[PDB]
Structure formats: C-alpha cells, structure tokens
C-alpha cells in the first residue's frame, strides 16, 4: 500500500508499549537522557569543571551524586562529542561536562517526543488532547530553567546540575543571589503547586467520602464497575457538604476537573516566566522604598531587611567554592557576620 | 525568613521527611493536573462548539459526564496498561492519599527537627 | 445582517471567580507597582 | 515611604479595567431573556 502506510500501521499497532511516530523521537532521546544521567552519577567526576566529587565511583551517595554542568569557560557551547572542545575523545568529553549538555539536549527532545506521544495517542484513542496541554507546563519549566536561564547567564555552569544536592544548591543559589522567594511569579508558582496538592487531596477525599453504597462489602473499592454509566459518588451531597463547611462548593463536575487542570499548569507557567526574568537578572530583589527608608533610618528593621542580610551571607560564604572560576578570595574581615551588624 | 533560618540551623533540604513532603506536593500537583486533564479529555459530547463544555453537565445528573474507559485506554497507552487505574474509587483514594501522606511526613519532619534531629 | 454574531454570556460564578482573580493579582502586584 | 507614584494609578487600573469588563459582561448576561 506504500511503505509509509505499512510503516504507519506497524508503528500504531496495539502492543504492551505503544510506539507511534513520536516513539522514534521519544524512546532514543529519553533513553539516552536517563542512561547518561545514570552513567554520569555512577562514573563521571566533576573535578575539572567544579572541583567536586559527584559520582558513586568517587564515594558519593544517592543524595550527593550529580551530572554537573560544564565549566564556566565553556560558555554556551553545545559541547558535542565531535565538537572543537572534546574533539572526538569520550574521556575529555566526560571530563569537560559534555554529559550535562548530552542529558539536557536529549531530555529536551525527549520531552518534545513525549508531548507528541500524548497528541498521537489522543488522536488514535479519540480523546481531546488536554493531557498534552497540561504537559506544556513541565516543558515550560524545563525549558526556562535548564535552557533559557543558563543561556541568559554567562554559561551552562549556572544551570542546575542533574542531582539531588546539586538541585538543593540551585535553590539556595537562587535565594542568595536572586531573592527568588520575593518574586511574585514564583509566588504564583508556589500557589499553583500547593493549590494543586490541596485540590488533589480534597477531591480524592471528597469522592471517597461521598461514595454511593453500590456493594455489600465494607471495602468499597470492589463496588465500582468501569463500564457503569452512573456516578459512583454523590455530587449533590459533596456540594452540600462543602457549601456548609467552606461557604462555596463546586456544582459542575466538568468545571471542577478543568480547574484541577488549570491551577498547577498556570502556576508552573508563571514560575517559568519569572525564571526567564532571572535569566536576564531581572529580579524582584528589593523594594526601593524600603531600601531608602533603611538607608535613612538605622533603627528600621523588617523581615525583608533581615532576608537581605541573610542573602548577603549566602552570597559571600558560598561564592568562592560555588564559583571556582572567579578565584574569589574573601578574607575573614570582609565576610558578613551578624556580630558585626 | 523562617525558611532560611530553619535551613541554616537544621539542613531541612537534606531531611528525608521534607523530601517526602516535596514529593507529596509535587506529586499532588502532578496528579491534580493529570486527573483534571484526563477527565477533561474524555468528556462526553453534550454541547455545541459555541457553547462551553461545562454546560454539558447538569448538577445532580445520574449518568457519568465523562467516559472513564476512554480515559483509561489513553493513559494505559501512554505508559502501559497496568500503570492505569481502571477503578475510579481506587484512583480517587490514591489522589487523596499521596499528598496527605507526604504533608504528614513533612509536618513530622518539622516537629522532629524541633527536637534537633536534623537532616543528613 | 451578519449571521455569524453570537450572544456572549458570563454567569455570576464566572464573575465572582474573575473578580477574585483580579483582586488577588492586584493585592500581589501592588507592592511591586509601588516598589 | 517613597513609593512609585504611578503605582497608584497602575494598581487602580489593574483593578478597574478587567473587573469592569467582567461586570459589563455579567450585567448584559442578566438582561438576556
């Protein structure tokens, strides 16, 4: 029927793991991203890029292994294996941080492939593609944080390193240098994530506690049939309960589930916008009125000014080791201390 | 300020109870978006293109407003067939249980660091 | 007469939700607008 | 405090222009039958 049609029928054949046309992009890229992370955290050091041990081979544990970012002198180089930095040598490629760019690029294209997989499966199954719409928010977060943020900064060095404690360092770095908690876009992100967790818990508990008695057993899970046409829980009772407890309640189930879609997706998109702002150092670091007031009044002290002092401490005490390329030598007398404020 | 001083004194980020709490809230947001998108994806056609789809549901209607079998088929093809809930009651119990248990563990983490049992 | 015109609706629930969104966004961003 | 003066008008318009919009739509929804 044509090689394209026969290949298309093979790719969308029902099996244990769906392949599809998107699988050609997804499975290699996702497999290489995961395998590169496991290989880097198992074997590959960060000694020449960060001056850090970050592999199981060096003695780190699961919390402290990472595939670290390339050195700051690499700039925003793609760091291809055949590129001018590694020149085909796999060992120098690993030593220079090429595994980080490997994982980041293959992970980006794997995320693209997974979203295309969502679209393809929604097309063949026959459902609306709202799962892909919702997955646009993790993609926005990944693109803003792992790609746009280092591209706005000096190099790939200041992107997050793929590891647990390295991500914790990234959090503390953003607090100390960007005052990222003070950013309203991050605030909307936090509201979206915590509201999504609240909505998950509250909707699950509400459904589980407004169930219809559809079976004789005391374990209600077997009282549900997937092919049943009736609702398994009482929306009227749930609406009455939440109207009398909280004042307001959902009355439209479709609006409820769209709202569950809407809240964390919008939160993640807002946080991605804020991260783009931080990529250009367009931070919400300070309030100018409070800076002027604190300059003109030594006795003025708020929690915001204390947070600024804590950020100064973070910056000065972590910068020489977190940024070894700058050769920061801070003598003891210039380090901020509370006993000198 | 409370967060930063707490990290300074107790290293809460390296405490596994706080990591369980982060897994709870991140997973709660994930599963909230996932459940919302899967239900919204499998809504049964009851309206026109000009009308909002929310008007397809009547408050107190007896029939289900979305096809759970179609949603299960989609999600089973997205990962694999056994990672998908065919039982709506089991799925909603999981939605309740994951962030609640995670937040329980992070609250207990704050209490245990109150007695100075700090993170790794 | 143009046959493509359609009536526009906004129920009271959408009014309350939109007002809540606008007022909460204003409460959040007003400190940054004043700076 | 030495705030940005335009912040006031900014905040006011940030409240007024969308809210009014919603109010307009809501009121013209109530008058339809």
């Amino acid at each position: 029927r044509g090689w394209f049609d026969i290949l298309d029928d093979w790719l969308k054949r029902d099996r244990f793991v769906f392949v599809g046309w998107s699988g050609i992009l997804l499975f290699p890229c996702a497999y290489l991203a995961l395998g590169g992370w496991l290989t880097g955290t198992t074997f590959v050091t960060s000694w020449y890029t960060h001056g850090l041990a970050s592999s199981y081979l060096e003695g780190c544990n699961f919390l402290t292994v990472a595939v670290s970012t390339p050195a700051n002198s690499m700039g925003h180089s793609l760091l291809l294996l055949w590129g001018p930095e590694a020149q085909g040598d796999f060992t120098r490629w690993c030593q220079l941080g090429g595994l980080w760019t490997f994982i980041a690029l293959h992970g980006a294209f794997g995320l693209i492939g997974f979203m295309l997989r969502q679209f393809e499966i929604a097309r063949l199954v026959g459902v609306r593609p709202y799962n892909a719409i919702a997955f646009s928010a993790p993609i926005a977060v990944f693109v803003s944080v792992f790609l746009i943020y280092p591209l706005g900064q000096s190099s790939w060095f200041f992107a997050p390193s793929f590891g647990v404690a390295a991500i914790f360092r990234f959090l503390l770095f953003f607090q100390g240098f960007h005052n990222w908690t003070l950013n309203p876009f991050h605030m909307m992100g936090v509201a979206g994530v915590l509201g999504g967790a609240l909505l998950c818990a509250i909707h699950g508990a509400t459904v589980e506690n407004t169930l219809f008695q559809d079976g004789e057993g005391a374990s209600t899970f077997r009282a549900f049939n997937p092919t049943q046409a009736e609702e398994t829980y009482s929306m009227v009772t749930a609406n009455r309960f939440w109207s009398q407890i909280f004042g307001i309640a959902f009355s439209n189930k479709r609006w409820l589930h769209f709202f569950m879609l809407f809240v964390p997706v919008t939160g993640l998109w807002m946080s991605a916008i804020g991260v783009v702002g931080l990529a250009l150092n367009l931070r919400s670091y300070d309030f100018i009125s409070q800076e002027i007031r604190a300059a003109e009044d030594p006795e003025f002290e708020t929690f915001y000014t204390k947070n600024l002092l804590l950020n100064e401490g973070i910056r000065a005490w972590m910068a020489p080791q977190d940024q070894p390329h700058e050769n920061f030598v801070f003598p003891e007398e210039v380090l901020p201390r509370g006993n000198a404020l | 300020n409370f967060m930063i001083v707490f990290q300074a004194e107790h290293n809460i980020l390296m405490h596994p109870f706080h990591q369980l709490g982060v897994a709870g809230v991140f997973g709660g947001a994930l599963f909230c978006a996932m459940h919302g998108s899967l239900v919204t994806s499998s809504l049964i056609r009851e309206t026109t293109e000009t009308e909002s789809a929310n008007y397809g549901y009547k408050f107190g209607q007896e029939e289900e407003t979305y096809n759970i079998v179609a949603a299960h088929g989609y999600f089973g093809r997205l990962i694999f067939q056994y990672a998908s809930f065919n039982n709506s009651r089991s799925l909603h119990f999981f939605l309740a249980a994951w962030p609640v248990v995670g937040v329980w563990f992070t609250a207990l983490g704050i209490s245990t660091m109150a007695f100075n049992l700090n993170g790794f | 007469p143009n046959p493509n015109r359609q009536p526009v609706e906004l129920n009271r629930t959408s009014l309350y939700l939109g007002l809540l969104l606008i007022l909460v966004l204003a409460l959040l961003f007003s400190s940054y607008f004043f700076n | 405090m030495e705030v940005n003066q335009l912040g006031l008008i900014a905040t006011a318009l940030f409240v007024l222009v969308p809210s009014v919009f919603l109010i307009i739509l809501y009121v013209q929804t109530e008058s339809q039958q």
Partner: peptide, 30 residues
C-alpha cells in the same frame, strides 16, 4: 496612599467573599 490601597483591595476581597457565599447562584438539581 499605598497602605490605603492595600486595605482597600483586602476589603474588596472580603466583600467579594460575602457576596460569593450568601448571594451565589443557587445550584439546582436536574
């Protein structure tokens, strides 16, 4: 005027809470 703005927005939010609870569109069965 910035304090007045914050208190005004908060008061508007509380009034909106009142109207959304007690003057809501009543949910009707069927």
């Amino acid at each position: 005027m910035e304090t007045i703005t914050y208190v005004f927005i908060f008061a508007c939010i509380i009034a909106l809470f009142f109207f959304a609870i007690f003057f809501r569109e009543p949910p009707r069965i069927t």
